[PDB]
């Protein structure tokens, strides 16, 4: 009873009518019958319905319809590229059936609210994916499918047509093909790969222009801030060597015992840290 859901599926209305079938469909993964839920998300929306059984969601920690993580809204291949691939799960036939069975007993014996072993891992995060995690609901995802009479030029329902009248996606784009099983296991997922390419460009971690340099060239200081903000932020890292301050261009230089600590302060800092409700931007030299 009650599905497991994204906030993005469930709807942008707080009031929702949602129907239930006892054994509605096989799950497209572990292939068992399971309680299925439909509901209307919104005014122009599509009537989504749960695609996979609740168990294999608890297993990989995901929405039932979307298969996007609960916290990050990221396809599974991504958050695995983000932490731990070694979760695994047999893809192969009768194994899948077997492992699902056992893991279904293991889950039965848990407190109920926890994605099994992954959650022991799931706490430690934020490497990148937080910064590539999506922020707001994305409703373009629930729109009705593309009317396929109209996309041949004919559709004779006129304005009534609940489907959507517009140009489809060119089958050329590798982002088209998108199997379900595939998106689930984290194989060759085009979306996930795209997000990976997007991850790399994040100006961030390579640093190291020069050896031993712990000099921090800090842009976007501002004249509200004091140094004491700086120190009481940065004593976490280690033994400071010193701090140079310039308020004429509002840039603050810093120096630490080891370069390692400076890299760190970059990492922890870059395009993340803000104090005095004002962004504190960092660069090398």
């Amino acid at each position: 009873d009650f599905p497991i859901l994204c906030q993005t599926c469930l709807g942008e209305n707080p009031y929702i009518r949602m129907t239930k079938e006892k054994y509605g469909k096989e799950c497209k993964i572990c292939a068992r019958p399971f309680t299925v839920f439909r509901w209307c998300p919104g005014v122009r929306m599509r009537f989504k319905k749960t695609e996979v059984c609740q168990t294999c969601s608890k297993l990989k920690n995901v929405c039932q319809t979307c298969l996007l993580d609960l916290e990050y809204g990221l396809p599974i291949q991504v958050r695995d590229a983000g932490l731990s691939f070694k979760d695994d799960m047999p893809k192969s036939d009768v194994n899948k059936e077997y492992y699902t069975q056992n893991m279904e007993r293991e889950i039965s014996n848990s407190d109920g609210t926890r994605p099994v072993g992954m959650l022991g891992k799931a706490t430690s995060t934020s490497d990148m994916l937080l910064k590539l995690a999506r922020t707001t609901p994305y409703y373009k995802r629930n729109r009705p499918h593309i009317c396929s009479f109209w996309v041949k030029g004919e559709c004779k329902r006129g304005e009534e047509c609940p489907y959507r009248h517009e140009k489809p996606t060119d089958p050329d784009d590798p982002l088209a093909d998108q199997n379900i099983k595939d998106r689930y296991y984290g194989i060759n997922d085009p979306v996930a790969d795209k997000l990976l390419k997007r991850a790399s460009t994040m100006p961030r971690l390579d640093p190291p222009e020069d050896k031993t340099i712990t000099t921090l060239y800090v842009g976007g200081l501002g004249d509200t801030i004091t140094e004491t903000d700086l120190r009481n932020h940065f004593y976490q890292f280690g033994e400071i060597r010193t701090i140079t301050v310039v308020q004429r261009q509002q840039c603050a230089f810093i120096q630490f015992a080891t370069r390692q600590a400076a890299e760190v302060a970059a990492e922890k800092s870059f395009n993340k840290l803000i104090v005095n409700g004002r962004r504190l931007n960092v660069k090398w030299g």
């Binding site: 009873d1 009650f2 994204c6 906030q7 993005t8 469930l10 709807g11 942008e12 209305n13 707080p14 009031y15 929702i16 009518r17 949602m18 129907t19 239930k20 079938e21 006892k22 054994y23 509605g24 096989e26 019958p33 509901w39 609960l70 916290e71 009768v94 059936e97 077997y98 069975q101 293991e106 014996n109 891992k121 430690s124 922020t135 707001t136 609901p137 004593y235 976490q236 890292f237 280690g238 033994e239």
Partner: protein, 173 residues
């Protein structure tokens, strides 16, 4: 001043013995001592199960305990009244189960039931802007002339960690 684990005022990163300063994600499951005594090596066996469920492992368990007298409150049959309680609760629970089984032999649900949900995503732009939502659950009507939808026959191969056992001459051989 020390700069080593050996040796708040310091204003230094110091980690005094062995608190880890870099990610490891180590497998090891914490060794434990309980109250006065023992490294809880029996923790191996429980591992799969919950703390609640018992499991014998130490030698002491195996060794005999004596006597207990002609009788003591220690061994007695819960009582009349405990039995009545147990029996009654059991009886009702079984009956529920049986009725479900019996549902097959005897081939109608009308409840509208509302639920209140807290999400876990929140963030104030996720809903219109509500810490909760409400969902009216309705059971879908089944077509009575619909055949069994899907096929159950498929068969997949079949325990607990074994409890410890605690239980020859050449000529005999």
């Amino acid at each position: 001043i020390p700069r080593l684990l050996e040796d708040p005022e310091i204003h230094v990163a110091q980690y005094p013995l062995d608190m880890g300063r870099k990610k490891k994600m180590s497998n090891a499951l914490a060794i434990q001592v309980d109250s006065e005594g023992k490294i809880k090596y029996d923790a191996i066996a429980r591992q799969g199960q919950s703390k609640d469920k018992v499991i014998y492992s130490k030698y002491t368990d195996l060794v005999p305990k004596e006597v207990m007298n002609a009788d003591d409150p220690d061994l007695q049959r819960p009582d009349e009244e405990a039995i009545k309680e147990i029996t009654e609760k059991t009886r009702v629970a079984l009956e529920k189960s049986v009725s479900q089984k019996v549902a097959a032999a005897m081939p109608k649900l009308a409840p509208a039931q509302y639920i209140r949900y807290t999400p876990s995503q929140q963030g104030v732009a996720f809903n219109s802007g509500a810490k909760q939502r409400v969902i009216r659950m309705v059971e879908m009507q089944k077509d009575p002339m619909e055949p069994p939808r899907f096929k159950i026959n498929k068969k997949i191969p079949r325990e607990p960690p074994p409890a410890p056992v605690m239980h020859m001459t050449v000529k005999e051989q």
